[PDB]
């Protein structure tokens, strides 16, 4: 069974090539899931890429509203209709002939019907829909062209369609969802079945942007600096270019301090760096940075640093990934920083969060970008948190900052927890922050049980 | 697709400009969600901000009741009668004509219909509803005017409309909710879809006030330092706190959080500065006594119109309501610094999602108006450090003042330490402090003591 | 919009004045929720207070049963009907006229219809109810008098009414619930909406008594004694008159011993004290008390002590509050004692329990009553329990009793954990119980980690 490329970032890989050619695919989903955007994008790409004439049979919506609505993604369907590339037919076998005729009249290969559930209210009786639904499908496959039928849904986790019979008639079934968990929406796509072919099972996180749908389905020995010389000595000559570093520690340990020095070092070597803030504001970050002896304002003036401040609770994880990607695709940094991951995990699912980290890490490694992500531990024992963290198994380097109470004084300690394919210092060296940055000193030799955060004289 | 500024506090940002031009927006919700209120506000602002002629089509309620109902928000009906900028049509295509007629009879632009679910009593079939709903939105778009059709729902988490078909006919869908979790209602508005445009997905906390709906959508940083009330505490923070900064004092029950809040507010009024104290644990009567027992006359500071106390039981109103109160109270008095006693009193019997959205708002607004916020929180463990790390609101704060009990020689002594100070140097020593009739007396730290963070140290 | 006072303890504050005048309020709820009791109480109060003639339109019930049923709250509707103050009309616009006529014939201002859901079985068809329901409402508001319509419900957390359309017709909606959680009923009232006015949102705990419905929506420096001189020295001269004391400790620490001495001290100063027991029985309490050297039997003979023994598992929290209040309103004590709160929290919700403590504390402070509540900790570390307790943040004084194992002997220790707006001793003094009460001795000076319950020689 040949598959027809839809040129939809993700769907191509999820459908193992695309949609079965000569057959009809059903895209069911609730209101605002993006059933019309998909059907349009399936046609547009078809004419904008392989130049394969395509017809869109409208119903509840008009040929003007569709074009005007398609303008949101910067598309000109009028020019596509002015060149006879696309045909929008306004709207019981009078339609089947009109489509069969129009298709042959414009030598069409890709058709989209949005929606059939609209023109079935006068029928109902469940079995009535089926018989009329089956006839259409047969009248399509007989013509020999591939389509993507649109169907309405009531529940996100209920019947496939409205009459729960359209799925058994259609050859391929794609379900568009928009689940609401914790007052936060999430668009997920899934291929229920693909008769006479293979596909990726389960749901995949997607978003809607000006580009349209965005379904989200080497190892060089080159070392880079972190901004701190002592830390580079502890990492056996700084981090790797194509590596993921992780700074985990208690609140106010110095995660943001290390990120500031990591971003500065990029801009100091005339290299672009993107800082994704989710805890502090640009105003505060600029002040805090300057207090340590770093002019972030200057770094933005040299077009070598871009601060992307935003609230984690605002947008969803799926959207946050689309932002970093787009922002990374535009500025094209040498190294990025996420401050922090703990701010993006609160009020989120462990499953939906794991997929975020995989994407950011994978993309960062795919574009050969040195990513330094931070994370605030939920326990006073940093080691316990790092071991309890499922994102710590994915990171290549782990910088652990731990509070150590010594002589009734809350001192701080830093240690390179792990360093993949590179020697690192295994000593828990103490450090003190000043008006110039970190000052990594010696490691507590005459103390025991320092991992608890409260050592004892040996 | 041109938008239409509804002038609704929040919706403008949530809708990325407002509602699509010459398009039909559906506002579904249960009874008491505020569909009619929203519908009135939409038109009201239209002919009181941009002079936009709009008509309100009624069905269940009459032109007098509606006009009388808007009297709770101080809105007169002189715009619909004397002025003639409004039009209340008392109440299948017999009405559509009148809508268009009146529209062109005042060069219309904004329309509001409440409710369209009530004009389908005769018809019980969903198919019929769609057909009539479809032709309505069709004509409307043909005329070219911003319509805000209002429908009703049965479940807060179920069908979009009563017949679950109106959402597919309408171009835009807005769902007003009023969820009840733990015998407490929560009004949340959400934009389901906006055909041919972008918007904020998911539901946003809103409240209904005398000004109507109050939707709450989700470089300064000066180095100017302010005093906390305690001299030694200012020396421990490297010259007092920051002006536009959030401070948090966590500790076991009876550690001295309220004592620190009392000096923070006193110091304000001492420099002829206004300070609002938000109480949620003790009452004014009690607070005045304890305050005076520490050597502070809060009654005096209230007499100088410099201090205000807003006592209220947490377990009564919703977090969104508390947020609306603080804002309004801060917008009225306009203080230099505020105090919340406490965040733990407002966290009990609330969701971590709903509670984190609160602190973000208060912190955000406090910093957005350059107000020094001293928030407190009673720790649920005897190891204060554990609780601070466990706290997902401890990362949000700029300064953290940790108070913790320390058993020494079979005596329950207390210790204070500046856990962290964002973009500032602070003392890293756990100095013991005592409380008396003059207030806190920060002493020295414990040199020959180990495992002090445990609450029960050992002689070194 | 003017509001009409219903003289219902609570509703006045929950409705911010009362019910919208010239409009109709809908009181929906299940069977036994108290829809008829409310409607009657709305009329009675109207004639017994502002003397505003009122008419009750009955249906399934008769004008005799209603009066006989109203006798339970000690009301004489016959005398109200014998004076032409109330009119009970026995029982499709023949009724609207009968009401419109009768109302004007008796110059009525308050009307009650129980129930409309009864006279709608022959109609049904959902939309039919609406049209007939809307007509009634319009025929009422036109007359210009305020009402409280009664409607039946199926589920406690489901449709507002039976046809789920009455809520959209009515101007104001009040829902009476009777939720069953853990084989225990709880009556909650709520104002869904109030068109053209403000109200308290969410549900409020209410009960039914002989008084009818019972919706439940200074700081002097005067010090009082606890019965123990050493404890008064540790509290800087005893507790405050308008203060809440809390005795938290492990089972058999001496909570009941301290409560006995606290109640005795009241009766010793010719002051009335109420002891609310929930763990031990009067028989046992009398014996235990006498064993320490206190004649509680004598204290009851002097009309200075009243023991209110009851089982927590019997009645609900809402009811327990109504008892203390009524019992406090009758005897009018100087100081009360709850033994204990831990007995009233088992098999209850943390939310429904927090509201109980607020009420008892608030009322105790409103009537200037010194309340000493006890609580049995669920851990061996008293400090951990006090910190973990959400009721410990509301109490003004916290007396912590902790078991301390010394020299293979289970000794006991007492300490004033906190004392609001008063100096207190910060020493963990040991104590031993004898045949005369508590003997607070010195504090363990040569021991460390005593808070664990198992110290160590220093
Ligand atoms: N340019 C854009 N930028 C951002 N978001 C957009 C943009 N255009 C559309 N959207 C979002 O994506 C959605 C796409 O709606 P679409 O018309 O595809 O809905 P549908 O699934 O066909 O629904 P219906 O059942 O009403 O036909 C919009 O409702 C909006 O939330
Ligand atoms: N100018 C300064 N001089 C000395 N120490 C400073 C200075 N500025 C900040 N610090 C120290 O740095 C700490 C904050 O570091 P940073 O904000 O990087 O920590 P973090 O762990 O990233 O914080 P958060 O918990 O907010 O994410 C402060 O608590 C303080 O102890
Ligand atoms: N001044 C006010 N202060 C506080 N709350 C108010 C005020 N005015 C109105 N409200 C609240 O807002 C509600 C307004 O009801 P509204 O008419 O907006 O409801 P609706 O969603 O249109 O209901 P319906 O199902 O009858 O159409 C009141 O019930 C009340 O809860
Ligand atoms: N006049 C006083 N003299 C001495 N100590 C006092 C005096 N007033 C209060 N205290 C001390 O202060 C404690 C209460 O301080 P404060 O109320 O500020 O603490 P908190 O942490 O806010 O407690 P809560 O858990 O009640 O909110 C008392 O337990 C006592 O130790
Ligand atoms: N004097 C009383 N003392 C205690 N409880 C009482 C007393 N009188 C009534 N009750 C309780 O309150 C309830 C009040 O019943 P009421 O007649 O108000 O029911 P209703 O909600 O109108 O129900 P229905 O749907 O049957 O009309 C009684 O069923 C009983 O449980
Ligand atoms: N006559 C007595 N002489 C000495 N000790 C006594 C005497 N009577 C009781 N006790 C001590 O008092 C303890 C009980 O005290 P009390 O009943 O007040 O404790 P409690 O903590 O309130 O109990 P509960 O856990 O049942 O609530 C007994 O375990 C015993 O050790
Ligand atoms: Mg569509
Ligand atoms: Mg940080
Ligand atoms: Mg309405
Ligand atoms: Mg306090
Ligand atoms: Mg009844
Ligand atoms: Mg006892």
Numbering used by the authors:
A (entry chain A), C (entry chain A): 18 to 108, 123 to 248, 257 to 497
B (entry chain B): 18 to 108, 123 to 249, 256 to 497
Authors' own words:
KaiC, a core protein of the cyanobacterial circadian clock, consists of an N-terminal CI domain and a C-terminal CII domain, and assembles into a double-ring hexamer upon binding with ATP. KaiC rhythmically phosphorylates and dephosphorylates its own two adjacent residues Ser431 and Thr432 at the CII domain with a period of ∼24 h through assembly and disassembly with the other clock proteins, KaiA and/or KaiB. The core oscillator consists of the three kinds of proteins, KaiA, KaiB and KaiC and the clock can be reconstructed in vitro by mixing the three Kai-proteins with ATP. When co-incubated with KaiA and KaiB, KaiC exhibits circadian phosphorylation cycle as follows: ST → SpT → pSpT → pST → ST, where S, T, pS and pT represent S431, T432, phosphorylated S431 and phosphorylated T432, respectively.
In this study, we focused on an inner-radius side of the CII ring in KaiC as the research target based on our recent observation of KaiC crystal structures, in which an upstream region of the phosphorylation sites (T416-H429) at the inner-radius side undergoes a structural change. We thus inserted a Trp residue at position 419 (KaiCF419W) to monitor the conformational change around the inner-radius side in solution by fluorescence spectroscopy. The F419W substitution had little impact on the overall structure of KaiC as evidenced by backbone RMSD of 0.42 Å between KaiCF419W and KaiCWT. Moreover, our biochemical assay demonstrated that KaiCF419W is virtually indistinguishable from KaiCWT in terms of clock function. Crystal structure of KaiCF419W-ST revealed that the indole ring of W419 was oriented toward the helical structure on the neighboring protomer. This suggests that the phospho-dependent variation of W419 fluorescence reflects the environmental change associated with the helix–coil transition. Although an interpretation of fluorescence from tryptophan in proteins is a challenging issue, one of the potential quenchers of W419 fluorescence on the basis of crystal structures of KaiC is a sulfur atom of M420. The side chain of W419 (or F419) is far from M420 in the ST state where the helical structure is formed, whereas they are in close proximity each other in the pSpT and pST states, in which the upstream region adopts the coil structure. Crystallographic analysis revealed that a side chain of Trp at the position of 419 was oriented toward a region undergoing a helix–coil transition, which is considered to be a key event to allosterically regulate the CI ring that plays a crucial role in determining the cycle period.
